[PDB]
Amino acid sequence: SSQVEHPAGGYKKLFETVEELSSPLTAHVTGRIPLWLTGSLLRCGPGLFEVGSEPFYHLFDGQALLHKFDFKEGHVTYHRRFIRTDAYVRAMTEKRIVITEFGTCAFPDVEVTDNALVNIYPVGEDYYACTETNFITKVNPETLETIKQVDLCNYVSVNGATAHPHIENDGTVYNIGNCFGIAYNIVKIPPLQADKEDPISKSEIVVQFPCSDRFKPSYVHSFGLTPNYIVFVETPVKINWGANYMDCFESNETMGVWLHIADKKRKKYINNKYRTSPFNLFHHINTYEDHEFLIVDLCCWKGFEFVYNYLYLANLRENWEEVKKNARKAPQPEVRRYVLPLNIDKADTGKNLVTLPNTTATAILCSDETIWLEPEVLFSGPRQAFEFPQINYQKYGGKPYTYAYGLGLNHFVPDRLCKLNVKTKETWVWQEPDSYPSEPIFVSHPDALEEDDGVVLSVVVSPGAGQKPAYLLILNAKDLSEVARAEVEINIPVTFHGLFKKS
Amino acid sequence: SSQVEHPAGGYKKLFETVEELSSPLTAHVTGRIPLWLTGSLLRCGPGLFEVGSEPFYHLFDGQALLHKFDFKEGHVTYHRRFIRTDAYVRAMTEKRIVITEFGTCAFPDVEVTDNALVNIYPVGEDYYACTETNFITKVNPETLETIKQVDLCNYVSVNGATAHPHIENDGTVYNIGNCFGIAYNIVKIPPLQADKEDPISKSEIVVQFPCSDRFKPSYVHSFGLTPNYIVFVETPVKINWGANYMDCFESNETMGVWLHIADKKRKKYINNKYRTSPFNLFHHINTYEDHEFLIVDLCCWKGFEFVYNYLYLANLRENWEEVKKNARKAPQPEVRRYVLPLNIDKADTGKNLVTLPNTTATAILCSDETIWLEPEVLFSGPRQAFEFPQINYQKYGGKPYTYAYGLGLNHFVPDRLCKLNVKTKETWVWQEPDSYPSEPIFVSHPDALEEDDGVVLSVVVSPGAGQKPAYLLILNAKDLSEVARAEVEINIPVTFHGLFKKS
Ligand SMILES: CNCC[C@@H](O)c1cccc(OCC2CCCCC2)c1
Ligand SMILES: CNCC[C@@H](O)c1cccc(OCC2CCCCC2)c1
Numbered sequence A, B: 001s002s003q004v005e006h007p008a009g010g011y012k013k014l015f016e017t018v019e020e021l022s023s024p025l026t027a028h029v030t031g032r033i034p035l036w037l038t039g040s041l042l043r044c045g046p047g048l049f050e051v052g053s054e055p056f057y058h059l060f061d062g063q064a065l066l067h068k069f070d071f072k073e074g075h076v077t078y079h080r081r082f083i084r085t086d087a088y089v090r091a092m093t094e095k096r097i098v099i100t101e102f103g104t105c106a107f108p109d110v111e112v113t114d115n116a117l118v119n120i121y122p123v124g125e126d127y128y129a130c131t132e133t134n135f136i137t138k139v140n141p142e143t144l145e146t147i148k149q150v151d152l153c154n155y156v157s158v159n160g161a162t163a164h165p166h167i168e169n170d171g172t173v174y175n176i177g178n179c180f181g182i183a184y185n186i187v188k189i190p191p192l193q194a195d196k197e198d199p200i201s202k203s204e205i206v207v208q209f210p211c212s213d214r215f216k217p218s219y220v221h222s223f224g225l226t227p228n229y230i231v232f233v234e235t236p237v238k239i240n241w242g243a244n245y246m247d248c249f250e251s252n253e254t255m256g257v258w259l260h261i262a263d264k265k266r267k268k269y270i271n272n273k274y275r276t277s278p279f280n281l282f283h284h285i286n287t288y289e290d291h292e293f294l295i296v297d298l299c300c301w302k303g304f305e306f307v308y309n310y311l312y313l314a315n316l317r318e319n320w321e322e323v324k325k326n327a328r329k330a331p332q333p334e335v336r337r338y339v340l341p342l343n344i345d346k347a348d349t350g351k352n353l354v355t356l357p358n359t360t361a362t363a364i365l366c367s368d369e370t371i372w373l374e375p376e377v378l379f380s381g382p383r384q385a386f387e388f389p390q391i392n393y394q395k396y397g398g399k400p401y402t403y404a405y406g407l408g409l410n411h412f413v414p415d416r417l418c419k420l421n422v423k424t425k426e427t428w429v430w431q432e433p434d435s436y437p438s439e440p441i442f443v444s445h446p447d448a449l450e451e452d453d454g455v456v457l458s459v460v461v462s463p464g465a466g467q468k469p470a471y472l473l474i475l476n477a478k479d480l481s482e483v484a485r486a487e488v489e490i491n492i493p494v495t496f497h498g499l500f501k502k503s
């Protein structure tokens, strides 16, 4: 949990327009930057929150800005370029809002947004900025130049795809998106071949999940992947002149949450009706196999009201007392472990199927063959969200694991970084006053012996009066103790997701 | 949680017949017994697990045995007398099982059991041993002699009543039992008056709770009481030639848990449809008012299967590996805090009503006006139950509080004592190997300043080879550190509940 109030209201700088750079600034380093940390931290966020006099209204509306902290020769540089999407380019041309964003209608004076403000990920030897639509944007990871717009609909049958693809060690990319049978399609993009042809052209649908409602797909933000299984969590947040995307969402009050598994290698949906209470879900933490069971660790929001309702820029820019009051009736954040039995015997009707020795999660087989789940709670703090989770993905993604790292939200305001032992429930916190960190990204020591041998990187906004406005923070993953800090003399807005590109 | 295995199987001594005493043994004291600890610890449990060659089958079937540890003049005595119930007296006369018990049918060769093996409580200046039927037994707290059988049905309209009445500071007794409209009646017994007439003769029904099923009442074990409110939790464990009580129980798979409030002083049921997921509930921990909300702390079992299924004597007497295996598919124990809003505005339909600052419990108002609850988990350990909860009842019962004490069950085997801070979730544990404690009872220091200024008393069975077989354990409530121990040279079976009678 957090240990601060924010009466000074410095978090407002997260939601303030900035200018791009012509070329990289040098950052001033305090501490020793590890010699083995060579590469680029790339992150996406909104950078332009109005077009002239026309405001963007929602957190997910501001125009995509690609950021890079570069570690070479012990020195550190910062660079940022707006992504030259159709949304951004037409806005610059017409000097107004041309494309409708998540929570802002453009008025003429369905063109789907390609405002790729959410994440960046590798396909083959390319990198793509994304949002959650059919449009992803190829970008240059060195120069931050925009290369091209790609429309997934040219290749596969999806209406969109998440900003949270899973990537296997061989470069194979999995993702999920809404489609028509309404269903949800798992997309697979292969690694780059010898033939060197663009892997996107080899995309295919490998498996389809059914939808709880004939005409209304659930919003899907992420999903789980293990070596053998795909996990999809179907939540009660449903998609139904001048409307935006937000206006189409509604809450199904009666369905609760439906959980779904598919055999990855046999490409089969499994007909197990996993059921539980209502929650929002944005981020899976990790998923893994333990005997005949899937362990499904989730960042939940307890409630069926759409949490994005609380993320309009006007509300996030209020003073601190009003921000707390605004969150009073929001869903409560909670890290939960669910355990899904794979080997279900009808003889166990009426009983708890979760026979594992080290969990309190349950799964009750009912007579109608629904399997009713209760979670093991891993972390719970009043309006203190463990969110934007990251793990040692390369080695522990899809596998038995012990540690997650997260961004701590205090009434939706990011004000700390956290580490969670998912087995013992012990936590560690890094926090300084009037400091607003980003999602922590884990980078493994090249000679790691243990899961947490490495560092986490976070971009911190520190708007205090006698302060460099922002800095790249490097923590030791062991205990979240500070290793170094690379300060810059310009503001940095909120960033959502990214990656560390080793070189 | 527990830190032990029990391969020696000493816990079997909990379920072994003992003989009563003709008069009190002196206990050998190690440590200093607090000078202020003057009075009697009275506890009830089964003491006779077979009648000749006929076995009792269930944990709740053995014949009631009243125990007393007496603290006078620094010395400590132990005494026990079987309660002379109809069940016990007719069994001794006919030398067989005459009355049907919870899980043992008597074969001739509805007489409702009066085997008061569960608890003892004060009414006026009298003490009554009870089970959960209409028959309670007046007993002599000094000599442990049986005085009379009392039939509640002579006085009030209940088919039975729990062994967990609430007692107000003025001696007013509240209880709950099944009745016919099927409903649940709150019974109130006043304090002793000047007129000196037996308070039971002044019993009345003050309020009635509705039942979820026309013909099937839920099993009720306890309930919540605050100065202003009564809380009843309606669980999916339902009551439907040679049958016993256990044979009548079944699980409702679809209803979940229904929670109910009544205004205590206005004697009104409140028509708020509080709803949540399925669990068994035996023990409320404490209940209190916090602004427009009720805080409801519960010892839950996650699942709808009846937990009493796992408590047959044959299963509890198995060797340790089999005991663990037997519990694998049992409901998982979990301490949960629920928060019930009293002031519900229809304008908040679809949102979380729990606006308190220091909880993660939620309550969602739905369009059909059901209020869907999620808990804040206070304690959760794999098959490690925090059970038989006790608090500083006199001063903190029905009121804001911080501490609970419990018996720790390891796959249903009692093997430790626990203290829980319900606000911070910190725990403390007392445990020794091959030692099987009872419910801890809290006794306040007569000059207490803080909630945990006092001691807890627990009867410990220690069957090891070079060991006194049993002892009264006194812990400091601050940290569960040992203060003293009063050893006896005979076995003591399992005891469920009791009280400390100051004198
Ligand atoms: C963290 N960003 C959340 C909102 C944003 O990505 C976004 C922006 C614009 C449209 C969106 O929804 C796309 C839609 C999803 C359902 C299938 C059809 C496309 C989503
Ligand atoms: C911890 N003891 C639990 C079982 C025991 O008290 C018991 C023993 C015999 C009959 C019982 O149920 C009584 C019944 C409850 C429902 C209303 C009618 C009486 C209950």
Ligand SMILES: CCCCCCCCCCCCCCCC(=O)O
Pocket (backbone or CB within 6 Å): A059, A118, A163, A282, A307, A311, A387, A407, A409, A412, A413, A414, A437, A438, A439, A494, A495, A496, A497
């Ligand atoms: C610094 C990060 C953002 C802080 C302010 C917004 C808080 C977001 C809380 C909701 C959960 C996250 C859902 C969106 C995740 C995403 O952008 O991919």
Ligand SMILES: CCCCCCCCCCCCCCCC(=O)O
Pocket (backbone or CB within 6 Å): B059, B118, B163, B282, B307, B311, B387, B407, B409, B412, B413, B414, B437, B438, B439, B494, B495, B496, B497
């Ligand atoms: C030493 C105490 C009993 C230990 C063995 C039985 C474990 C009981 C676990 C179930 C929860 C308690 C329900 C019955 C409570 C009661 O007797 O009033």
Ligand SMILES: [Fe+2]
Pocket (backbone or CB within 6 Å): A163, A164, A221, A282, A283, A496, A497
């Ligand atoms: Fe995300």
Ligand SMILES: [Fe+2]
Pocket (backbone or CB within 6 Å): B163, B164, B221, B282, B283, B496, B497
């Ligand atoms: Fe009890």
